[PDB]
Amino acid sequence: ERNKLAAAKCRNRRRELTDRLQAETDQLEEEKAELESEIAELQKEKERLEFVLV
């Protein structure tokens, strides 16, 4: 029970820094994944069009 309060009280301290950094990490991971899907889709479209011209 003493280590529960020790760890909880520990993490509650100045947790706003780690929360800002972790949130930013989340946004950047999502933006990353969606950018990757956009790149794949755009490459498929590019190959398609190039096929169309010929």
1 makes contact with other proteins (CB under 8 A):
no
16 scored as a contact of other proteins (CB under 8 A): no
**Residue 54, contacted partner among Cl ion, other proteins, none, CB below 5-8 A by kind:** none
As a residue count, the chain comes to: 54
Asked if 17 is part of the footprint of other proteins (rule: CB under 8 A), the reply reads: yes
Which of other proteins, Cl ion, none does residue 29 bind (CB under 5 to 8 Å by kind)?
other proteins
Amino acid at position 48, single letter: R
Closest alpha carbon to 28 in 51, 11, 36, 40: 36
